[PDB]
Amino acid sequence: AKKAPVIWVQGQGCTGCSVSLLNAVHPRIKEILLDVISLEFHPTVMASEGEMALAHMYEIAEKFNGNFFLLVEGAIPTAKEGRYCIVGETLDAKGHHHEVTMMELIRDLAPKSLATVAVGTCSAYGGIPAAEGNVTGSKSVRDFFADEKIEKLLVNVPGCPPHPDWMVGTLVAAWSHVLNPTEHPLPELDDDGRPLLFFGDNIHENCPYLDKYDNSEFAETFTKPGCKAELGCKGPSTYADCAKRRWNNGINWCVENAVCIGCVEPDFPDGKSPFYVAE
Amino acid sequence: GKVKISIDPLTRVEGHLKIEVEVKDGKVVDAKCSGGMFRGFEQILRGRDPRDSSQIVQRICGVCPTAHCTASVMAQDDAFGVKVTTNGRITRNLIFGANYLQSHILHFYHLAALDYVKGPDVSPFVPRYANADLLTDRIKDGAKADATNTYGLNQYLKALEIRRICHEMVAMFGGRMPHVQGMVVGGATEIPTADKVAEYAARFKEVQKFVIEEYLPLIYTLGSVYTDLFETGIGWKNVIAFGVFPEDDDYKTFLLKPGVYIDGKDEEFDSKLVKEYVGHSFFDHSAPGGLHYSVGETNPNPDKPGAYSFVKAPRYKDKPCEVGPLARMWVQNPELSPVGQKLLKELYGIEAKNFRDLGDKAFSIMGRHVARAEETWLTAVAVEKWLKQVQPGAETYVKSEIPDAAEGTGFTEAPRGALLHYLKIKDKKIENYQIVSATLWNANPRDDMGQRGPIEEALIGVPVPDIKNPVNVGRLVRSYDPXLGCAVH
Numbered sequence A: 001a002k003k004a005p006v007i008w009v010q011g012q013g014c015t016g017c018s019v020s021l022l023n024a025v026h027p028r029i030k031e032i033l034l035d036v037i038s039l040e041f042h043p044t045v046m047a048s049e050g051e052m053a054l055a056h057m058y059e060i061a062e063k064f065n066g067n068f069f070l071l072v073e074g075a076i077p078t079a080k081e082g083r084y085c086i087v088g089e090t091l092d093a094k095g096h097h098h099e100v101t102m103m104e105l106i107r108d109l110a111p112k113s114l115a116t117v118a119v120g121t122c123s124a125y126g127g128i129p130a131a132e133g134n135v136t137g138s139k140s141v142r143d144f145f146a147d148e149k150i151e152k153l154l155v156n157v158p159g160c161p162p163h164p165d166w167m168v169g170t171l172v173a174a175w176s177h178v179l180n181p182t183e184h185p186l187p188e189l190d191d192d193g194r195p196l197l198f199f200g201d202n203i204h205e206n207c208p209y210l211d212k213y214d215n216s217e218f219a220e221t222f223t224k225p226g227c228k229a230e231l232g233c234k235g236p237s238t239y240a241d242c243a244k245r246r247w248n249n250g251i252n253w254c255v256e257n258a259v260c261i262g263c264v265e266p267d268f269p270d271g272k273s274p275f276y277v278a279e
Numbered sequence B: 001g002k003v004k005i006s007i008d009p010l011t012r013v014e015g016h017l018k019i020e021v022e023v024k025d026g027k028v029v030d031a032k033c034s035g036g037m038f039r040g041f042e043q044i045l046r047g048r049d050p051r052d053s054s055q056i057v058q059r060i061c062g063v064c065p066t067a068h069c070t071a072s073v074m075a076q077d078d079a080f081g082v083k084v085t086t087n088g089r090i091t092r093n094l095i096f097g098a099n100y101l102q103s104h105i106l107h108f109y110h111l112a113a114l115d116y117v118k119g120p121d122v123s124p125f126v127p128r129y130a131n132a133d134l135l136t137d138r139i140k141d142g143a144k145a146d147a148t149n150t151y152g153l154n155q156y157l158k159a160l161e162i163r164r165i166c167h168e169m170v171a172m173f174g175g176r177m178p179h180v181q182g183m184v185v186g187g188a189t190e191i192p193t194a195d196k197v198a199e200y201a202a203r204f205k206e207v208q209k210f211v212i213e214e215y216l217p218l219i220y221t222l223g224s225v226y227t228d229l230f231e232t233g234i235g236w237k238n239v240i241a242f243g244v245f246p247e248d249d250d251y252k253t254f255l256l257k258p259g260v261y262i263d264g265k266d267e268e269f270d271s272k273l274v275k276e277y278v279g280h281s282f283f284d285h286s287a288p289g290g291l292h293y294s295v296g297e298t299n300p301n302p303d304k305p306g307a308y309s310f311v312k313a314p315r316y317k318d319k320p321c322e323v324g325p326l327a328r329m330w331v332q333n334p335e336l337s338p339v340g341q342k343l344l345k346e347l348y349g350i351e352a353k354n355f356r357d358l359g360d361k362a363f364s365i366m367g368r369h370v371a372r373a374e375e376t377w378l379t380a381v382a383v384e385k386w387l388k389q390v391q392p393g394a395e396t397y398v399k400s401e402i403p404d405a406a407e408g409t410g411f412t413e414a415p416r417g418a419l420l421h422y423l424k425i426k427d428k429k430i431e432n433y434q435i436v437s438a439t440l441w442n443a444n445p446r447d448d449m450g451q452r453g454p455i456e457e458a459l460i461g462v463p464v465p466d467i468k469n470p471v472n473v474g475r476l477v478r479s480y481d482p483x484l485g486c487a488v489h
């Protein structure tokens, strides 16, 4: 029952990907932490801090070289020599202090990893931090890898936030592959590096409101009956299995409640905006 | 004989925080608080459809997105000239209130408790400080130590499921969580049904049971072991609150009222007196003296000489003021939970009816945890009431149109403290959007006059008898429940 080693790092994130992971069911987060993964470093929940936390991260990255998953939450800002995201401070054989940027951290850990998994639209595609108006040179993992000429297996699990089923499912599939690659091939990815397992279905094609759409029955406001297209629904241009899976253990989902804002797509948010204007 | 301690990352807070302290004669004598990550939501927002803001701003933070959503939709309601219905107001309170319960529970257990509770010997519970001064170290009776630690750890583990249930409650009328869809300008997007109100209520009763029977008893028990921690982590003793959970349609009355307490005196909250300084922050201001948020400017400058943080420095009448449950509970001064009244007597020999009866003990490391636990109970009492008030079928949404030119401000309290969003609209687009947001008031750096931020100041005097295991530094910081994503945005 060997657990998957995980180093979870945050750049320009909101911790929402982490919080969504905490909402996992079947398995729930307790079983994920005790039975499925070894969460070696995670800044939001780990016991150690500062020097001890970083020393432990680097020790794991060394001892489990080529045998841990680097999980990345949030974007990587490249403007001003990376100084829009300082992730920690390291201390030399002498007593002096050196800040570590998100750029430096990813450049360091990615080549040490077995695979990198970009969770959330920020890390996968840039997302909100990389949207029009930002001045931080905010970049996705794939773009940073391309600029750095880093060839490391990379899987994107987008969403803002992703559903816990997408994150857990992808990580379990990757680990199963490593343990027995011919019995468990890697999930097929689309052109944007995200698994077809979760991101192959078009929301609109699979939407329970499709009959209403077809009969031109459109909700005049949020609280009227009908398809949500006129209220801004981006289901037509969005690929995720939300219509099947729903959210928060099946309690509700964006389209029933309101509109899809296309949160899993590489052009989120700018290509999906304005949110309350029809596509 | 001064020793410097630098902690970066200061873990088990949200986002990117560095803490630096100077220690002399076993106590902190100086401190610096630094937020090291910037996104610039106020820049990103410019030129957009103002309605987009209530989705965009939630991505400031995945722990408290409902607070930002609330402030944003209220700013839009104000700017658009629309009044929310009774049922819309109540529905917004139910969506947001469920996350207050989630957030406080997440904080105490999953961020704070590993400074007191010894977890199992597997990552991420280890490694930890060698001399961590935990329940298992403090309680000298070994069986009592083991039993108390196990009691705390089992609650940590159970709280994982309880906080998840709180998010089911948020999703009920909010669509999903993190990052709700259900709050918009004009109200809420889904009218509560009788069935869904009942489903929210059933989950709520389970959360409420945990709060009363497990969480409150643990906090009071914890404080009875760490009585020294009611006597340090003091700070300015200045607090501010904006009002949260309006209880009537004209926003005249709240669950927790607005107010200010500075230098031992209560005063009303006047939003005109909020301003932000940037002398030690990585930002350029067009004019000296600090800026009111209605003319706020977000011009990042990581090269600014003398600056050390991406957090601006808000002051009220030029005073540092802290925010959060301590602030709100001090200002409102509500009656304590029955559990609190009883356990304060039984475990401490303290007779207390109202929050202020804690006196000096309120303004401390343990005081902040007590305030948060008591507020969780107080919020649960309110949610229980709102569940009776909400009317299945009653309209929650009122139509509106984007104005050409307008301004609006949404005032609320995030779980971590006072929150406002200021919105200025020109040519139907966001001209300026300025966020003044909870941890901003706590984790800010020195202002232009050298006045330390509240966390910086509260660190002064904190005991550090073991420099290699400076556990009380983190304990103080985490008592404030910082969110650095919110602080910087």
Ligand code: SF4
Pocket: A012, A013, A014, A015, A016, A017, A073, A074, A119, A120, A121, A122, A123, A127, A128, A159, A160, A161, A162, B059, B062, B178
């Ligand atoms: S993808 Fe969305 S939820 Fe995840 S870190 Fe980015 S803003 Fe937060």
Ligand code: SF4
Pocket: A203, A204, A205, A207, A208, A209, A210, A211, A213, A227, A228, A229, A233, A234, A235, A236, A255, A260
């Ligand atoms: S526009 Fe949206 S609500 Fe309408 S059928 Fe398509 S996905 Fe469903």
Ligand code: SF4
Pocket: A159, A160, A203, A238, A240, A242, A253, A254, A255, A259, A260, A261, A262, A263, A264
């Ligand atoms: S329904 Fe649309 S906005 Fe909601 S989670 Fe799925 S892809 Fe994202």
Ligand code: FCO
Pocket: B061, B064, B067, B068, B414, B415, B416, B417, B419, B437, B438, B439, B440, B482, B483, B486, B487
């Ligand atoms: N609670 C919360 Fe987040 C912070 N600080 C906000 O606003």
Ligand SMILES: [Ca+2]
Pocket: A148, A149, A150
């Ligand atoms: Ca290279």
Ligand SMILES: [Ca+2]
Pocket: A083, B302
């Ligand atoms: Ca610098």
Ligand SMILES: [Ca+2]
Pocket: B042, B312, B434, B435, B436, B437, B489
């Ligand atoms: Ca601001």
Ligand SMILES: [Cl-]
Pocket: A023, A024, A025, A164, A247, A248, A249, A250
């Ligand atoms: Cl779920």
Ligand code: NI
Pocket: B014, B061, B062, B063, B064, B065, B483, B485, B486
């Ligand atoms: Ni937050």
Ligand SMILES: [S]
Pocket: B063, B064, B065, B066, B067, B068, B096, B099, B100, B103, B414, B415
């Ligand atoms: S929140």
